[PDB]
Design a protein around this nucleic acid. Structure first.
Ligand SMILES: [Zn+2]
Lengths: 120, 48
RNA sequence: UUGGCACCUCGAUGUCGGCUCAUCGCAUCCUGGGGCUGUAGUCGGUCCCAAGGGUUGGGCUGUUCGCCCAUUAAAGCGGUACGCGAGCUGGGUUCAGAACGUCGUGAGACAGUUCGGUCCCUAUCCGUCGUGGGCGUAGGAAAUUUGAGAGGAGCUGUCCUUAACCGGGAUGGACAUACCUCUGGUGUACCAGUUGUCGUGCCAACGGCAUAGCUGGGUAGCUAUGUGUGGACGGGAUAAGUGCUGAAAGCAUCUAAGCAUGAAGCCCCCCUCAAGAUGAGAUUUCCCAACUUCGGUUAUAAGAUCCCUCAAAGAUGAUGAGGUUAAUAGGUUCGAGGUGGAAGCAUGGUGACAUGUGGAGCUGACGAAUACUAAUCGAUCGAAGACUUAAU
RNA sequence: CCUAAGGUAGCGAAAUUCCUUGUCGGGUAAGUUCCGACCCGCACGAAAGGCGUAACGAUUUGGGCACUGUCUCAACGAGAGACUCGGUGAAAUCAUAGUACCUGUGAAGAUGCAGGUUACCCGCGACAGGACGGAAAGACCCCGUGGAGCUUUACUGUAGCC
RNA sequence: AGAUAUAGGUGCCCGUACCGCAAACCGACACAGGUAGUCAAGAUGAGAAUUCUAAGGUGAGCGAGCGAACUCUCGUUAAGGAACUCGGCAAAAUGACCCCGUAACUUCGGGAGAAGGGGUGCUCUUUAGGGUUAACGCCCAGAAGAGCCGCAGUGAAUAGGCCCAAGCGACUGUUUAUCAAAAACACAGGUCUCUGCUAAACCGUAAGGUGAUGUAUAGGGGCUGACGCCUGCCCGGUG
RNA sequence: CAAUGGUAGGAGAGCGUUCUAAGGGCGUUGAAGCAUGAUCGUAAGGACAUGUGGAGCGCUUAGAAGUGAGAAUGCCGGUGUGAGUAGCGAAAGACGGGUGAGAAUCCCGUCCACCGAUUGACUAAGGUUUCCAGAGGAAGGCUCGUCCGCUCUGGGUUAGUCGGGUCCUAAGCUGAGGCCGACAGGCGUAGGCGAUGGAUAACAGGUUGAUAUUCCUGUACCACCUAUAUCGA
RNA sequence: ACCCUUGGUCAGGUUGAAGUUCAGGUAACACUGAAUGGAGGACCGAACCGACUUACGUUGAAAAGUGAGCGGAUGAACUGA
RNA sequence: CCGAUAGUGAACCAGUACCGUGAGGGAAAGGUGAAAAGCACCCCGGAAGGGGAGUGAAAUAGAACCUGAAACCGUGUGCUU
RNA sequence: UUAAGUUAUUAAGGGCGCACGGUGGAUGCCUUGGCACUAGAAGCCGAUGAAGGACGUUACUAACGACGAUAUGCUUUGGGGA
């Protein structure tokens, strides 16, 4: 497990934000150290969604954050509803995977190595 | 704790023998005849 | 050691004791070997050879010394700026305050005590501990190696037997080294109990913050106080010694020629490093054409590298496991070990709570399967073997 | 015999006692410190007070209980710097430097001198034995017919006062 | 002494921005320091303490990695438990409210929170009252019983370690801004002395002042230092 | 033929630098200065050729001096070394969208964090335009910057009642005449100055990018003035 | 540093002086009980003011600081103009 | 007599920046060309900067603008390691 | 083809010479500014409000000079002539 330059309390809160951002935007640019680490956090959550029951929706709420998604024509949705409803039906025959990292150059103000994370 | 003699120009240019940088990987792109880093995306009609 | 001299240093060469880390001498404290004894045995006394290793914890005092207590085979003595303050400490000693005895008309002082009291520096060069790159080793590579030379290790209690020596056994102390199966420590992305308070609209379930809020356990890894191993048996040449044959010297004599014997020491034996050992060694494998203006040159080969996924390796780099003709990491699936009975539901109870469903549910590093995601496409380097002589 | 008079009480090896770690008792396995006693007070002593004293003290000294990584003897974990990469970027110091070692030599303790020994060329992370390493024209010690504050029955004056 | 109740209007100058526990002020800096006063909610509490939040404000003017030594700041540790050290330095341990208990010595006030022990969570029964109100209500407190859970109930945070004996100074207080906080200085009390008022004493050339709008139970100076029991001899020398 | 090592010192002969006199010369067909060269004299030193440079400058004899530098922990300038080294000043951010030549760092959003007897709201002092709106990115900002307390050019502070003066006095400071003193001046009476104190008539709501008990709306109060016995030390 | 004039600040809790009243007791006092009362360079502890210990800092964030503990806190207190 | 480190501290918006509570202390900083004839227009760039074209005897005479030494910092190379 | 021997290629970097550049402000030439004097002439200003200052005035106005609400000047007498 990487430590990412934070303290274990800040490192935990920073991945609960990274994970809820993949669930909402489907695609984010991070650094390549936070991408390798947060793929494990969002993939262990996809299996809670596609597992289905109530006790696994109780364990997804220990990680996701309370954010509302604005759908088309004002039909709001919670980030935990979008994960157990819609991200759990397209990934119902894939056995591992779910996510894709793509490298880019070094960014400008420090040469940190930019990366994109998708859902596959 | 402090230098006893100054450093000559000869001894200064030898220490700097290894203070240099190398070029990047930088292969050519198949989609556009171009240059990109190996294993990264192309910064010109970004393909991979 | 106390001094004699005043040659080095006043535009600064930092005291005493202790701590850390040592290193050398031998005029030997123990252990090894011997001669003499006023040596019966057990213990000794003395002198010779011997520096391989070893050579303790406390009380009192700033102490060094010294005196004690309890041990040990032993509690050696000295040099190294009375070793070591750009390694540490600052208790004594000679900074400013204050006081006692004493001396002085006094300011003050010590022929003496007492309580308090500021130790700076980012390593340039040589040195020395690690770890890389370049060139060389007459073609370019990949492995395996010899060992010139170097560095380690070397300690010795008690008991049983022989029954005091010489002989045989069994077990310890202190030091080294490798390792995590065992007993333990830690274990901040592991499980559980619990308090205050603010939240997810409420109940129930949960999240933030309070040293990781606090408390009870704990996987891998790293670890000692834990678990194993080691200094074994021996050879060569000698020391002080003990001799044999033997004359110089018609006898004697270990010595001059000869010949033996003889130590924890010397050179090996054991353990690591070692062809930059420029004297650059050796084995068995791999690759081996086109073009010239005949001078030589290109790219390519075998081999590597860049870049990327990594850990058993790691400051970096290097070393190792792999890159689709793929199990290298992640995810997924099943496990080992850890926690110790989830949620929901139903029953019992007035209630806090209990029981069942059910060794439940969760679970970071550990063992196996599986190409679902990423190790894509590419690029750089890298040989055609000089002339002398002698044999074929 | 001397003097103006010769130290009373109370305390005493002491914030005072040099000899001295005095002696004896107590406390510890072992007590130069500590407490109780002794009087031989180098050199206590009565308003520069003597002797005693409840309470109070970031006061000094000695001993107990508890408690501990202070220690035997160290091990693991978290974070900041160190370390690699991108940005920005000093200072002290400095005669010129291609800046080994040993035994000598020498202004009598050598990177640089002699005779030997050892060492391919250039980095990076570390440690502090030397460069009599840096910093401050030694504060110790002596010397200037140097300075300054203070003292008095040194000298010479003087404000004041009678 | 003295002297002779509505209706319309008029009202000047200076300050006024912004920072103001702060990057606008004093510290050479957009500097971990200093800077009077007013206001100040909820849960918990004796509280303006503690921990978490409101109104409101802020995210710190270099970052990304990796998770060596060594330095720093923090947490844990088998068995032992001051053997460490000049010295328990540092760390650990104590810590709240309630109840029971508490020694010598004393200046009778103290010593004293002496010491040394026990309790503390939640549920349900029944039980005595005390603020305000016609009652219900609404607040504030107690006692006894029967149970339930955990390793642990001030379940977190904040809140004295105790005792024995000796020296010094009675005590609260003051001091070497920047190496000394003390046994040194103050002190309440004690004593000696000088001073009869335009006082002595002190400042100043003087005039004017302090002393003092005081008057010997007052004022200045020297020594001593609470309180208790006391303070011996010497007037030759110096004043 | 003979002499010629030399510190402290003594003695002699000279070289070069600025300015003056007299004489005679050279210079836009290129003086001085600067740079380079394999030249000359016993030395200090003197020429010549080229390049650059753009207006002055040598020679001879004599005269006069601010007349020659490697050292003073010298003075001033400006450039190294140490060195791509130390540091970058207490504390949490993440992602999305947007703007731009350029974004970890600017603006908007969501979530998360931190203070809350204060990192909140006022207000003295002090500072003096830092305030507001448009625009900018040289330097300043310990990085970046499209941003700013920085630069540019336009703005912003409204009072009979708030605080101060046209009211009072304290400590202190001044003081006609006066008293004292070499000078200068010191002191002091009446009388004045002097808040940190006493006195003193306005409230609520709305409004700007920037001011409000000041502007606007509503409702007030105080002093004076004119129309329609009392005053009093 | 001392002083002069005129202002301001000190959360919360604990102790329980002298005086009084009662009741008892005495020829009368004196006395000893109980309430009441609210003294003090008193006690504990924030704000505030100080500076005993240690670590860190020592080309400091700072030409006297910071972290953790420590002392006073109704007075001979602290602090403004 | 000096000729920009000289000569007044000051040749220049000098008793000025700046420093200090104050008295007071006290700098650095001259030169386009005869004439502004001070580079219209094109090209790269957001701009700065530059390459051409033109003005001029001359533009390294382009506004820090006469000459332009040394220390110092570079790029290319003949011989060398 | 084997043995024995001898010598050369390299340059990561460095050294010396030479060319060409940058920084910098010495040197030369130059002068507005000062330094030392000589001859002549002055040797006081102020309540009729001084020396020295503050604030202002221009068509646009930071700043120096000039000068004052008659303000970047007003009148008169005399030079001078685009
Ligand atoms: Zn492309």
């Amino acid at each position: 497990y990487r430590k990412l330059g934070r303290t274990s309390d800040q490192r935990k809160a920073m991945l609960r934000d990274l994970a809820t951002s993949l669930i909402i935007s489907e695609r984010i640019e991070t650094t390549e150290a936070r991408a390798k680490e947060v793929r494990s956090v969002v993939e262990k959550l996809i299996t809670l969604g596609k597992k289905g029951d109530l006790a696994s929706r109780r364990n997804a709420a220990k990680t996701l954050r309370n954010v509302e998604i604005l759908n088309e024509d004002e039909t709001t949705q919670t980030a935990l509803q979008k994960l157990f409803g819609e991200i759990a039906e397209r990934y119902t025959e894939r056995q591992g995977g779910y996510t894709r990292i793509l490298k880019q150059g070094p960014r400008r103000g420090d040469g940190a190595e930019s990366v994109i994370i998708e859902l596959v | 704790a402090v230098p006893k003699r100054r450093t000559s120009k000869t001894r200064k240019n030898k220490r700097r023998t290894h203070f240099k940088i190398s070029v990047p990987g930088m292969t050519e792109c198949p989609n556009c005849g171009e240059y990109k880093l190996s294993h990264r995306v192309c910064k010109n009609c970004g393909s991979y």
